[PDB]
Design a protein around this ligand. Structure first.
Ligand SMILES: O=C(O)[C@@H]1O[C@@H](O[C@H]2[C@H](O)[C@@H](NS(=O)(=O)O)[C@@H](O)O[C@@H]2COS(=O)(=O)O)[C@H](OS(=O)(=O)O)[C@@H](O)[C@@H]1O[C@H]1O[C@H](COS(=O)(=O)O)[C@@H](O)[C@H](O)[C@H]1NS(=O)(=O)O
Ligand SMILES: O=C(O)[C@@H]1O[C@@H](O[C@H]2[C@H](O)[C@@H](NS(=O)(=O)O)[C@@H](O)O[C@@H]2COS(=O)(=O)O)[C@H](OS(=O)(=O)O)[C@@H](O)[C@@H]1O[C@H]1O[C@H](COS(=O)(=O)O)[C@@H](O)[C@H](O)[C@H]1NS(=O)(=O)O
Ligand SMILES: O=C(O)[C@@H]1O[C@@H](O[C@H]2[C@H](O)[C@@H](NS(=O)(=O)O)[C@@H](O)O[C@@H]2COS(=O)(=O)O)[C@H](OS(=O)(=O)O)[C@@H](O)[C@@H]1O[C@H]1O[C@H](COS(=O)(=O)O)[C@@H](O)[C@H](O)[C@H]1NS(=O)(=O)O
Lengths: 49, 191, 221, 221, 49, 49, 221
């Protein structure tokens, strides 16, 4: 979740507390996370340390 | 598909006939028990009021739907905004009993009183329409009610059908259309 | 000591559609038995599927009449639950209490002529994107359509498909709408043989995937 | 933090028949023993079944007198817990506190004549649907009835059956009611031999399936 | 019990919520129940049905 | 049920919260569901696809 | 009795950032599927790392121009998310909503000259503790720095390190601050060969350990 910090389980059922998502086919469809992790970190060329 | 229509046997074609794909349906909102389960208001009131679901407005979602059924059954919930204390009495009781405190009586507590009441009629099911030649020893038998309430003053009454059961459907009508094509109205939209 | 509790602001008010139940005050009542009472229905769409009701044409008739002249368009109407032609159907009666729909709507055509009256019809779904519906079978042929003729079986059923940009469509129509958002249905008469003044009854019912969501109480009270 | 809570509107008020209990304030009190105290009753209908009480006839008598003339109807009364004839019974005393009933009501007839007084009686249940009860055994014969004569056993018991349209019937009677909704009971005298001025006591009790539901507090206070 | 319909067990102990009964010897000392059940139901004499 | 979305079990017993149904014989006595499911879906006659 | 409870003072009020949820009133709504919708991002710093945006120099240009004269300092700016030169970056756009940061900020230099234009640059991080930044590569050499030349690869990336007294630094700058608390970055031009009027684009992005904490809503509304 994000910014909910209550320990106790909700008194109302999920189908009342929220809208229900449907699918056709929450997965790893995080484009920007992939993009960022793919960033080049090395060093192009030879090194003299 | 062609069929013998005079038989009145149900026929339900699908888009597959011409190459389509029938989709998935979720029909929770058209569930009878679910749809009838919400508060509806009763407009006419008085210090002494006999609970009759037919006093519901004919065009409201609950009243329209109830009238689109011949027989029905349900328990009930009521919200009453009243002055003084509220007394309820079951179906079949002498009107005079309403003055006695030993019948379920709710002492005034702001802002109103919410209560759960059981079905209480002597019939297995009730009706929205009754074809009586008379029915005595456009009128419904007096036994068709959920009891009565009384207070010094009754300002507002909401009623809710619980565990509703509907039988034998009847005509349900949309607004009469005057326009040449569609009934158009102002649908909500941001400013 | 006792259990501390925070009475929260913004919570507690009565909402007419709330998911709670009231407290009881009169217990132990047993109801007369109603075991196996006939005609029960649990979902509005079961009856909307099983019982087709009639459309309204011309001067208030549940049918369309075969044209004696050289005009072939028998009827044209908006694919809208708020259409004038659908205004007396049970389908529109239920639909007014919901904000959105999706799915198939079925049309039924029952020929009423005598044994010696024959005809050939065509029904087409004109999707949105054109300014006015075609009044010719030749122009409408390019759309999704079906043609049928008269014979031993008097009824023909056709499915108006749900084809739209969004996954759901509004049941009601806004005043700012010129052209019907979901298009039209056109019924044509290819020809006929001695079918003058003979009738074609047309009714509608919910298809297998017809769906209504978001309950609403819109009528003036 | 502490436990959040929504104090709900419309809940919390005192209802005189509520299913909760109050909080105690004075503990540890032990009562004197009342083990096996005699005459206990736990259901009003047990005593209503076991102890029949008398009906009220003519000028306030718990009996009916054998007619010396050629009139054979000894008594006629409404099958109603609110009937004048039942007004002094324990059965009607309990029934006034309930809105509905169902089931069997039993009538008892105890002959009071001398050994040399003989008679033959008949009791009939006249269901609703006829304008006035028959004053003749011949007409009443077509109904559910029982005939008995005098002898060593002085009492005869008959069950008034519950036959109605609805599953329950009202204990009270509305002012708009002309004819009794549940019909009548007619007691006849077929004949007698030297039984002039001899008496027949009649009482009532609850039958095995008699039932009262829906408590009510109707008397003026 | 009779006309109490709460599911949750009482917060107060029984010796506080009610007076405590004592015995010298709730049993089946229901006279009227016995009386009613003992009622004659048959038919005195011979029957012709 | 229908339009009740509370997780927690009711504080009041069922015989108080509602009237009690009795039988003589909630089953599948749903006429309209049967009627709708019995609807003809095929195609009368021969097909040329 | 019932459960005793202490309604506590000082608890119960609405706090706009509270960790609770409201009570629902309209249930059973299923959303149109949005499975695999493209371009999703779950953390602001993923896009801040992957998409570098441009710095602002001189008269509003995303680049620095090679000097024709004998002055070698191309640019000098405050290592501050509130710096004028960073004012148009996405990094500063996000940073304004947080009170503190820590970690690496990356600078990218992309040479824009023709094939026959050559140059040699140097970038240095001048930490705090000196009154004014050096305008000479010779003086700046003693700091952490990198030198690179022109060639087949047009871009060069350098990490501005987080070196401070406290573990976190403020994103905003106080009016009482004379010298920038976190120091400066100086870009120099060692030399060039026919690179007059040729450009060096400079952009910034979040490094691997860049971090923003403590959300804030500071803009005038
Ligand atoms: O004004 C109309 O729409 C006329 O209404 C229809 O009659 C209704 C009737 O009004 C209604 N009673 S209520 O109090 O309004 O609720 C109820 O009894 O139903 C009937 C049937 O209505 S339906 O929706 O058409 O099924 C007339 O039908 S009927 O009387 O034969 O039963 C209908 O023919 C009338 O519509 C005509 O007039 C319209 C406007 O009238 S005017 O121009 O101001 O004078 C016009 O817009 C319609 O086009 C016209 N119908 S047409 O197709 O024959 O031309
Ligand atoms: O007016 C009556 O009904 C007379 O009442 C009966 O007496 C009651 C008595 O009134 C009552 N006291 S209370 O203060 O009213 O509570 C209590 O003592 O009980 C007795 C018995 O009542 S019972 O319900 O009949 O059992 C007379 O009975 S008694 O006095 O012998 O004990 C009863 O005979 C009276 O009824 C006669 O009068 C009625 C109306 O009176 S009038 O016409 O206005 O003058 C009349 O309607 C009755 O038909 C008549 N009884 S009859 O069958 O002998 O004709
Ligand atoms: O006053 C300025 O800062 C001038 O603003 C920039 O234009 C803004 C424009 O004002 C803004 N519209 S808004 O209503 O303010 O939101 C929006 O359109 O963006 C542009 C670009 O702003 S940016 O932050 O620089 O990217 C001028 O740029 S542009 O018009 O070419 O697009 C910018 O050049 C202006 O700044 C100059 O003037 C400043 C103060 O003006 S004055 O002395 O009072 O007359 C001065 O402090 C700046 O140094 C000067 N820029 S310089 O580097 O060329 O010298």
């Amino acid at each position: 979740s994000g910014n909910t910090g209550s320990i106790i389980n909700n008194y109302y059922m999920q189908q009342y507390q929220n809208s229900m998502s449907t699918q056709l086919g929450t997965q790893n469809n995080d484009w920007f996370s992939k993009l960022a992790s793919s960033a080049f970190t090395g060093l192009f060329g030879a090194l003299l340390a | 598909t062609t069929t013998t229509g005079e038989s009145a046997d149900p026929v339900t074609t699908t888009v597959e006939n011409y190459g389509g794909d029938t989709q998935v349906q979720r029909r929770h909102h058209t569930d009878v028990g679910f749809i009838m389960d919400r508060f509806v208001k009763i407009n006419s009131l008085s210090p002494t009021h006999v609970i009759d679901l037919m006093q519901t407005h004919k065009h409201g979602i609950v009243g329209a739907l109830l009238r689109a059924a011949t027989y029905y059954f349900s328990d009930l919930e009521i919200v009453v905004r009243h002055d003084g204390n509220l007394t309820w009495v079951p179906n079949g009781a002498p009107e005079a009993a309403l003055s006695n405190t030993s019948n379920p009586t709710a002492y005034n507590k702001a802002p109103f009183t919410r209560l759960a009441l059981p079905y209480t009629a002597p019939h297995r099911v009730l009706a929205t329409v009754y074809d009586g030649t008379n029915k005595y020893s456009t009128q419904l038998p007096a036994s068709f009610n959920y009891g009565a309430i009384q207070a010094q003053a009754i300002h507002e009454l909401l009623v809710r059908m619980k565990r509703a059961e509907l039988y034998c459907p009847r005509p349900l009508l949309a607004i009469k259309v005057t326009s040449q094509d569609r009934y158009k109205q102002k649908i909500i939209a941001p400013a | 000591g006792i259990f501390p509790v925070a009475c929260a602001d913004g919570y507690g008010g009565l909402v007419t559609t709330d998911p709670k139940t009231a407290d009881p005050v009169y217990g132990k009542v047993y109801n007369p038995p109603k075991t196996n009472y006939p005609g029960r229905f649990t979902n509005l769409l079961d009856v909307a599927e099983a019982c087709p009701t009639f459309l309204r044409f011309d001067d208030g008739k549940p049918y369309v009449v075969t044209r004696a002249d050289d005009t072939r368009l028998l009827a044209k109407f908006d694919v809208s639950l708020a259409a004038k032609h659908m205004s007396n159907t049970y389908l529109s009666g239920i639909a007014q209490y919901y904000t959105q729909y999706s799915g198939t709507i079925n049309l039924h055509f029952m020929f009423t002529g005598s044994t010696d009256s024959k005809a050939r019809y065509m029904v087409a779904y004109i999707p949105p994107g054109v300014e006015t519906p075609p009044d010719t079978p030749e122009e409408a042929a390019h759309c999704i359509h079906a043609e049928w003729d008269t014979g031993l079986n008097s009824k023909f059923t056709f499915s108006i498909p749900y084809v739209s940009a969004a996954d759901y469509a509004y049941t009601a129509s806004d005043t700012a709408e010129t052209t019907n958002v979901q298009g039209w249905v056109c019924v044509y008469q290819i020809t006929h043989g001695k079918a003058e003044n003979d009738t074609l009854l047309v009714s509608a019912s919910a298809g297998k995937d017809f769906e209504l969501r978001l309950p609403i109480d819109p009528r003036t009270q």
